[PDB]
C-alpha cells in the first residue's frame, strides 16, 4: 500500500497513456477551434509549465479576473461528439480491458485499481510486499527489522534509490553500527551531483538546476552535527567551495555557519560575514525571519 521503487510494468499502461493523451488532443483541439505515438503523448504532456525559514511560494496578486460559463450540456456534447469516434478507430487496435478503461475515463469515472494493484507478476508482487513491510516497520519504530527490510530491498536489481529518506531517518534513529545518516547523505551528494523523463520527480534530481532534498538535508543536519559542538569552518569551507549561486537556502546555511561560529576582531569578521550572506541570500526566493532575529542576535553579539 506504499509507493514502489521500481519502474512500472510497461505494456498496458503505456497504451492507455496513448489513448488518453490522444483523446485529450482531439477534445482540446476542437475546443480551441470553437474558441476561435509516444511523441503525441510527448508534445501533449509538453506544452505546459513542467518566523521560520519558509521557502515561500508565489501568492495571489497580478492574476486575471474571471470567466463566465463556457460549457452547457449541448455545447459540451458538441465538443465531445466527434473526437470520440476518431477514438473509435484506434480503440479497435487496443485491448478490451483498455477499451473499457478508455470508455470509463472518458465517461469521467476513475479507476479503483492502481498500476501496482494490477502488475500481478511474482517478483514485483514480492517487492511490493517487501517495500510495504519497510514502510510499515519504519512507521512502527522497529528500526532493526526495518533495517533488514531496507538492506534486502536495495540488494534487489530493480530498485533505484528513492528510499534514501527511509535510510536517513533509519540510521538516524538506529544509532547502532553502520556509517550514519550523515555518511549516507554526503554520499548521496558526492555520487549524484555530477553527470557521471520517466523516473524523476524532485526528491532525486540532476545537478543542472537544484538537486534539492539530500543536499539541503546534509547541509542543515551537518550544522546540527555542530549543535553537537556548542567542524564549522569545514562545513562552510565546503559550502564556500561550490558555485551554484541560485542556491539561496545554502546562503542561509552559509550565514548560519557564520552565526554559529560567531556564537576578537576575528569574531567581528564572522559577524560582518553573516551580515553579507544574508543579503546575498536576499538574492533569491527568500528565507526570512525578520531583520530583528537576523540582527538582534548580532547586537547581542555586538556586546
Amino acid at each position: 500500500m506504499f509507493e514502489v521503487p521500481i519502474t512500472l510494468t510497461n505494456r498496458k499502461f503505456a497504451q492507455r497513456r496513448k489513448l488518453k493523451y490522444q483523446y485529450i488532443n482531439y477534445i482540446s483541439r476542437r475546443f480551441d477551434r470553437i474558441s476561435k505515438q509516444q511523441k503525441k503523448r510527448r508534445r501533449e504532456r509538453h506544452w505546459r509549465s513542467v518566523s521560520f525559514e519558509i521557502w515561500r511560494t508565489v501568492s495571489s496578486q497580478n492574476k486575471q479576473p474571471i470567466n463566465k460559463q463556457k460549457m452547457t450540456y449541448h455545447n459540451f456534447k458538441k465538443i465531445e461528439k466527434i473526437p470520440l469516434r476518431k477514438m473509435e478507430i484506434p480503440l479497435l487496435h487496443c485491448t478490451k480491458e483498455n477499451k473499457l478503461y478508455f470508455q470509463s475515463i472518458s465517461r469521467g469515472l476513475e479507476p479503483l485499481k492502481t498500476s501496482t494493484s494490477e502488475v500481478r507478476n511474482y517478483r514485483t508482487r514480492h517487492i511490493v510486499t517487501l517495500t510495504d513491510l519497510l514502510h510499515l516497520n519504519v512507521s512502527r519504530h522497529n528500526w532493526s527489522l526495518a533495517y533488514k527490510i531496507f538492506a534486502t530491498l536495495i540488494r534487489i536489481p530493480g530498485v533505484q534509490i528513492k528510499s534514501l529518506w527511509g535510510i536517513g531517518v533509519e540510521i538516524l534513529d538506529n544509532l547502532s553500527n553502520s556509517s550514519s545518516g550523515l555518511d549516507f547523505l554526503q554520499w548521496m551528494c558526492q555520487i549524484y551531483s555530477s553527470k557521471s523523463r520517466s523516473i524523476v520527480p524532485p526528491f532525486q534530481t540532476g545537478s543542472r538546476t537544484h538537486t534539492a532534498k539530500f543536499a539541503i538535508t546534509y547541509l542543515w543536519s551537518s550544522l546540527i552535527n555542530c549543535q553537537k559542538s556548542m567542524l564549522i569552518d569545514k562545513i562552510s569551507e565546503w559550502v564556500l567551495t561550490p558555485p551554484f549561486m541560485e542556491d539561496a537556502e545554502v546562503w542561509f546555511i552559509y550565514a548560519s555557519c557564520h552565526l554559529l561560529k560567531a556564537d576578537i576582531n576575528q569574531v567581528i569578521k564572522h559577524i560582518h560575514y553573516v551580515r553579507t550572506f544574508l543579503k546575498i541570500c536576499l538574492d533569491k526566493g527568500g528565507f526570512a525571519v525578520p531583520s530583528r532575529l537576523i540582527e538582534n542576535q548580532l547586537k547581542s553579539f555586538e556586546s
Binding site: 500500500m1 506504499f2 509507493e3 483523446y23 485529450i24 477534445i27 482540446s28 505546459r48 509549465s49 518566523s51 521560520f52 525559514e53 519558509i54 521557502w55 515561500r56 511560494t57 508565489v58 501568492s59 495571489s60 496578486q61 492574476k63 479576473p65 474571471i66 470567466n67 463566465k68 460559463q69 463556457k70 460549457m71 450540456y73 465538443i79 473499457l100 470509463s104 475515463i105 472518458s106 469521467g108 469515472l109 476513475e110 479507476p111 479503483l112 485499481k113 492502481t114 501496482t116 494493484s117 514502510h135 512507521s139 512502527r140 538516524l172 534513529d173 524532485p202 542543515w220 543536519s221 550544522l223 546540527i224 552535527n225 549543535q227 553537537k228 548560519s256 552565526l259 554559529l260 542576535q297
Partner: protein, 598 residues
C-alpha cells in the same frame, strides 16, 4: 531541527502511537471504476435552531445519512453524548423520501465570528439540489421536525460536484455559481454571480468548491489544479503548482476559518493564510505513498496550552487501513511535523466515510463500503486504566427446513453409531498383538495376497502386448481380497510383512516404490521407518483422543493401504509403449523427443 538549531538531532519528543475504543451507532465496470461525484453520504455536526437562540443552549449534535434500496431517502436524527457518543434514547429518526439517489450530504456549520450555528443541511442528488431547514427540535420526545427548502431539479442538465455554504454555492463539471437560500417558508433559491473553471483536458468528473478565510472568497478544484476566486470583486488565480507530477486528491477546510487541508498524491498540504488576503502555504509538508485515485482526507483539531494540533486521516476505498499524520499550531503560525502512523480495520470492504468531530484522544465515525453500519471509534495514546455473519457461508451451514435439520442429525447419528462399531470392532484386534493368532493371520494374509497377486500378474501376461498405453488396469491394490487387510493390528510386524513381500516378488518386471521417501511428504521430515510414522502420529493424538492407539493404528493401516503399491509391469514394460508412441508420431516430433537434456 529547523527551529532547534535556528535558535542556537532526534526530535522534540519520544515515540507514541495508536489505540482503539469501538461502538455501534446506527444501521440503515463498477468492479473496476468509481464515480467521483459521490463524496460522502453521511454527515454529523453541531446545528442550532431558532428556539435554541432564544436561550444560551448551544444547539444539538445531529446526524444526517442516506438510506433506501436506491439510496434516495434522507435521515436526520439527534445524538446525545454521555460516556460515548450515541443515538438518542427514544430513537425517532426523521426520514424524508426523495425520488433521486443521494450523492453528497454535508451540514455546513458556521464561523466562530457569527455567534450562531447552521440551521440547515443540504444535499446533491442525481437529479436535484435541495436545502433543508431544521426548525425547533424539542426534548418532549427528541423530535427533529425539518422543512424542505425547495429543490431545483436542473437548469443546465448538469450534475453538480460539490455544495459549499447564507450562501448556497454549487459546482457542476467546470462551472460554478454563487446563490442564496430563501427564508423559511413557501415562495426558490436564486443566483446572479457565476463562473467556470472548465478544462477540456481533464477527463475526471470531480471538481470542488470550498471557500477560504470566510473572507467571502472561494476555492475551486479539479484533479489538475487549485484556483482561488475572489468573487465579490473580479479575481482568479492558479496557485503555484499545476498538473505535472501529482493530482489534487482531496481538500477539506481544517475547521478553523483560516485553515486549509489538501491531499495531493504523496503530500499532505497545509494551506492557510499568514496574511489577511488569501494565501498559499509552502511551509513544508509530509508525503504519503500511492497511485490510488480513491484517497480522501479529514482533520480533527485538539486544543492544548502550548500548541493547537491537527490530526490528518487519509483513507481509501481499496483497503480498510487509515493513514495518519499530526501537525501543530503554536500560533506564531508555527507548524511542525513529528512522524507517521497507520492503523487497520476489519475483513473485506473499505471506508466510504471517515468523519471526525501527555496523550491524544481523537474520535470519529466510519462507514464501510457496502455495509449499512455506522461505527463510532475513539483513539487513545497508552494503556493506563469474528462474530461471523458471512452470509455466503451461513447460507451454506444453517440449511433451512426442519427436515433439513433432523436430516443432518440423522446422518450424524448414523456415522456416530458406526464409529462405535469401529471401536468395539478393532478393540479385540488390538487385544491380539504379537499373538500366534495374529502371526497365523500375517502369514496366510501375506502369501494369500501373494497368490492373488500372482494371478493378476498372469492376467497381466495375457494382456501384456497392448502397447497402446503403459498403465495396467486397476493395478495398485490389495487385489480383490479386502477382509484380509483390516484384521491385523501391529504396525511393525506389518511393515515387516510388506518388506518381505517386496522381497518375495523381487522376480523382476514388477513395480518398486519406496514408501519412506513419500511419508517425507506427510510429516515433513525424514520418516525412515513405516513405524516412526506411527510413533509421531501417536504422540500427537495420544495428547488428544481416547483409543488414540486404536485410531492411529487404523489410520496408519488405512494410509499404508491407500498407498500400497502394485502398478503396471515395471520400467521394462513402459519403454515399449514409450518408443511405440514415439513411432506413430510424425518423424521430426520424434526427432524433438529428447531425454537427458543437461
Amino acid at each position: 531541527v529547523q527551529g532547534a538549531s535556528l535558535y542556537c538531532t532526534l526530535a522534540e519528543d519520544a515515540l507514541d502511537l495508536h489505540i482503539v475504543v469501538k461502538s455501534l451507532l446506527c444501521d440503515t465496470q463498477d468492479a473496476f471504476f468509481w464515480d467521483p461525484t459521490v463524496a460522502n453520504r453521511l454527515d454529523s455536526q453541531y446545528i442550532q435552531t431558532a428556539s435554541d437562540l432564544r436561550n444560551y443552549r448551544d444547539g444539538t449534535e445531529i446526524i444526517a445519512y442516506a438510506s433506501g434500496k436506491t439510496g434516495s431517502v434522507l435521515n436526520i436524527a439527534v445524538l446525545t453524548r454521555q460516556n460515548t457518543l450515541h443515538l438518542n434514547r427514544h430513537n425517532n429518526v426523521t426520514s424524508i423520501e426523495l425520488h433521486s439517489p443521494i450523492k453528497s450530504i454535508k451540514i455546513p456549520g458556521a464561523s466562530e465570528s457569527i455567534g450562531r450555528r447552521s440551521n440547515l443541511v443540504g444535499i446533491i442528488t442525481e437529479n436535484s439540489f435541495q436545502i433543508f431547514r431544521i426548525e425547533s427540535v424539542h426534548s418532549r420526545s427528541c423530535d427533529v421536525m425539518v422543512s424542505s427548502s425547495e429543490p431545483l431539479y436542473f437548469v443546465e442538465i448538469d450534475d453538480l460536484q460539490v455544495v459549499d455554504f447564507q450562501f448556497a454555492i454549487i459546482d457542476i463539471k467546470g462551472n460554478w455559481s454563487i446563490g442564496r437560500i430563501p427564508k423559511n417558508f413557501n415562495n426558490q433559491l436564486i443566483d446572479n454571480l457565476h463562473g467556470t473553471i472548465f478544462d477540456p483536458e481533464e477527463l475526471s468528473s470531480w471538481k470542488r468548491i470550498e471557500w477560504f478565510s470566510h473572507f467571502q472568497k472561494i476555492l475551486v478544484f479539479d484533479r489538475s489544479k487549485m484556483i482561488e476566486i475572489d468573487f465579490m470583486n473580479n479575481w482568479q488565480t492558479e496557485v503555484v503548482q499545476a498538473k505535472a507530477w501529482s493530482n489534487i486528491r482531496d481538500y477539506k477546510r481544517i475547521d478553523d476559518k483560516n485553515g486549509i487541508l489538501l491531499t495531493s498524491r504523496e503530500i499532505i498540504i497545509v494551506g492557510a493564510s499568514e496574511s489577511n488576503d488569501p494565501v498559499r502555504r509552502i511551509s513544508w509538508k509530509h508525503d504519503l505513498d500511492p497511485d490510488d485515485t480513491t484517497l480522501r482526507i479529514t482533520v480533527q483539531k485538539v486544543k492544548k496550552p502550548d500548541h493547537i494540533l491537527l490530526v490528518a486521516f487519509v483513507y481509501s476505498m481499496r483497503h480498510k487501513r487509515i493513514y495518519m499524520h499530526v501537525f501543530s499550531h503554536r500560533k506564531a503560525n508555527l507548524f511542525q511535523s513529528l512522524g507517521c502512523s497507520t492503523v487497520l480495520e476489519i475483513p473485506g470492504g473499505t471506508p466510504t466515510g471517515i468523519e471526525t468531530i501527555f496523550e491524544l484522544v481523537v474520535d470519529f465515525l466510519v462507514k464501510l463500503r457496502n455495509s449499512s453500519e455506522v461505527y463510532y471509534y475513539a483513539l487513545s495514546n497508552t494503556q493506563n486504566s469474528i462474530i461471523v455473519d458471512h452470509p455466503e457461508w451461513a447460507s451454506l451451514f444453517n440449511n433451512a427446513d426442519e427436515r433439513e435439520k433432523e436430516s443432518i442429525g440423522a446422518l450424524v447419528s448414523q456415522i456416530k453409531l458406526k464409529e462405535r462399531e469401529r471401536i468395539s470392532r478393532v478393540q479385540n484386534l488390538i487385544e491380539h498383538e504379537n499373538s500366534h493368532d495374529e502371526d497365523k493371520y500375517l502369514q496366510d494374509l501375506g502369501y494369500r495376497l501373494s497368490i492373488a497377486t500372482n494371478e493378476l500378474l498372469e492376467s497381466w501376461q495375457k494382456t501384456k502386448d497392448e502397447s497402446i498405453l503403459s498403465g495396467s488396469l486397476s493395478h495398485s491394490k490389495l487385489k480383490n481380497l479386502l477382509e484380509n487387510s483390516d484384521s491385523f493390528a501391529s504396525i511393525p510386524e506389518f511393515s515387516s510383512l510388506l518388506d518381505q513381500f517386496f522381497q518375495y516378488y523381487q522376480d523382476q518386471d514388477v513395480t518398486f516404490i519406496g514408501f519412506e521417501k513419500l511419508l517425507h511428504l506427510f510429516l515433513h521430515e525424514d520418516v525412515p521407518g513405516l513405524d516412526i510414522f506411527y510413533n509421531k502420529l501417536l504422540q500427537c493424538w495420544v495428547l488428544v483422543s481416547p483409543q488414540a492407539e486404536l485410531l492411529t493404528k487404523e489410520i496408519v493401516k488405512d494410509i499404508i493401504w491407500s498407498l500400497a503399491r502394485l502398478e503396471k509391469p515395471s520400467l521394462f514394460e513402459p519403454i515399449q509403449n514409450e518408443i511405440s508412441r514415439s513411432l506413430s508420431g510424425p518423424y521430426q516430433d520424434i526427432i524433438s523427443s529428447w531425454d537427458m537434456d543437461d
